Amino acid sequence: LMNAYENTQASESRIRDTDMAEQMTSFTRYQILTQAATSMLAQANMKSQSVMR
Amino acid sequence: VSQLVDEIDRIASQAEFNKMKLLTGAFARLNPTASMWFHIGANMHQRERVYIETMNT
Amino acid sequence: MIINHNVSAIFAHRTLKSNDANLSKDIEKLSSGMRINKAGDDASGLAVSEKMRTQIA
């Protein structure tokens, strides 16, 4: 019963528990794309003021 | 000996992983009732079959 | 040049909004410590995960 408890626990932990190391990898990737997109959105708003001359 | 031989049958009867009997002879080679394949690739026919025999008294 | 509508800004907002949705998802995984928090991330896997928790307990 204890032996079967361990192997059953392993299988559920594999599917349900996140890979914390790999999750920080994706957390940083999307976080940078937010700053990259935010800067370009601020760039695009300034773009229209050119033709006022 | 009477109890222990009974215990041998009990494990095989109730050997379940995700509600499937493992040691009752279903996934054997000679007279199977189901086939266990793991799809271990990213394409069509990339799967390998596992045999588990009967392990009761 | 057209000043009535800013097509690039609409494109910029569209991709920025999507990334915040993926940024929100990752914080849920990191804070709870579980790969699946809301249904639909892996519906097939969530059923197997909850069945094993019943078997685990």
* Strand blocks (E) in chain A: none
Cβ neighbours of residue B48 closer than 8 Å, sequence gap 6 or more: B37, B38, B40
**Euclidean distance between CA atoms A28 and C23, whole angstroms:** 9
Task: Choose, out of A6, A18, A25, A52, the residue to mutate when testing the contact with C (most C CBs < 10 Å).
Answer: A18
Closest to A23 measured CA to CA, from C24, C27, C49, C17: C27
Q: How far apart are CA B26 and CA A4, in angstroms?
A: 20
Length of chain A: 53
Q: How many residues does chain C have?
A: 57
Please report, as a single letter, which amino acid is at residue C23: L
The answer for residues whose C-beta is within 8 angstroms of residue B8's C-beta and 6 or more apart is B56, B57
Angstrom distance (rounded) from CA A23 to CA C32: 12
Chain A residue nearest residue C44, CA to CA: A15
Residue of A nearest to B19 (CA): A8
- CB-based burial label for B28 (10 Å; 0-12, 13-18, 19+): middle
Q: Which residue has the tokens 């370009």?
A: A40
Q: What is the distance of C-alpha B41 from the center of its chain?
A: 23
Q: Does the CB of B18 have a partner CB in chain C at under 8 Å?
A: yes
Phi and psi at B50, nearest 5°, equal -115, 135
Tokens of B10: 């009990």
- The number of residues making up chain B comes to 57
Copy the structure tokens of residue C52.
């094993």
Closest Cα partner for B55 from B18, B22, B30, B29?
B22
Query: Quick check: C33 and A50 CB within 8 A?
Result: no
The CA-atom distances, in angstroms, between C4 and each of A28, A48, A49, C1, C12 are 36, 9, 12, 9, 17
Indicate which technique resolved this structure.
Answer: cryo-EM
Closest chain A residue to the Cα of C36, Cα to Cα: A16
Which chains have 3+ CB pairs within 8 A of C?
Answer: A, B
